[PDB]
């Protein structure tokens, strides 16, 4: 089981969601970036694992659940079984990560990607050990009802570049944004 990663897109006012959807209009290449980063496995024969909260799961259109080419795991304390289309369900991020050591997953999983929402990011960013945060900074304010927790700059370093990730300003639909990568290893 490989690295532990968070990936998020966040507006200038720290918003990540609004009424069960994204706060901004669809950004095709931000979506393509999300898909490629979470799907690409460095190891032949393995897939990455995506971990998400219950509301993030149901925010994906039904025709696109589960996220293709990745092993999907949902966090919830209320659901008694994985929702339809999913095969894994844990009560906490800690439980989910311990689950990746069991035989059914240990040999199938390469990278682990936390893909939201807010309380999943929060549990991960406080998780001890080696963590990377792939953060898209959308350079506008958008009305939001769900937010990304602030990064503790006493623990994380901002990398100037990351392999395979463009470091310059992007723009689609009139909206500028930038791909950032933070790292810690405590
Ligand atoms: N911009 C982005 O990068 C991005 C990413 C993801 C989602 N989104 C947006 O954000 C919204 C969804 O995120 P959200 O924060 O509202 O909800 P969420 O985190 O996806 O779902 C919340 C629920 O998931 C479970 N949960 C979450 N964190 C948990 C944890 N650490 N341990 C155990 N269970 C946990 C709980 O379910 P139970 O009550 O059943 O226990 C909780 O009520 C949508 O608007 C979506 O479009 C945006
Ligand atoms: C692209 C946003 C994003 N960007 C970064 N960088 N990190 C993230 N975690 C992230 O959320 C991914 C959440 C999964 O959403 C989907 C995956 C497949 C099909 C459709 C959706 C839902 C629509 C709108 F709800 C969407 O979200 O594109």
From Swiss-Prot:
InterPro entries: DHFR, DHFR-like_dom_sf, DHFR_CS, DHFR_dom. PROSITE patterns: DHFR_1, DHFR_2. It is found in: Mitochondrion; Cytoplasm. GO terms for cellular component: cytosol; mitochondrion. Changing residue 31 to R: Reduces catalytic rate 5-fold. Reduces affinity for dihydrofolate 9-fold. SUPFAM superfamilies: Dihydrofolate reductase-like (SSF53597). Keywords: Cytoplasm, Disease variant, Methotrexate resistance, Mitochondrion, NADP, One-carbon metabolism, Oxidoreductase, RNA-binding. Substrate binds at residues 30-35, 64, 70. It is an enzyme of class 1 (oxidoreductase). It comes from the Eukaryota. Its EC number is 1.5.1.3. NADP(+) binds at residues 9, 15-21, 54-56, 76-78, 116-123. It is linked to Megaloblastic anemia due to dihydrofolate reductase deficiency: An inborn error of metabolism, characterized by megaloblastic anemia and/or pancytopenia, severe cerebral folate deficiency, and cerebral tetrahydrobiopterin deficiency. Clinical features include variable neurologic symptoms, ranging from severe developmental delay and generalized seizures in infancy, to childhood absence epilepsy with learning difficulties, to lack of symptoms. Homodimer. Key enzyme in folate metabolism. Contributes to the de novo mitochondrial thymidylate biosynthesis pathway. Catalyzes an essential reaction for de novo glycine and purine synthesis, and for DNA precursor synthesis. Binds its own mRNA and that of DHFR2. This is Dihydrofolate reductase. It comes from Homo sapiens (Human). The gene is DHFR.
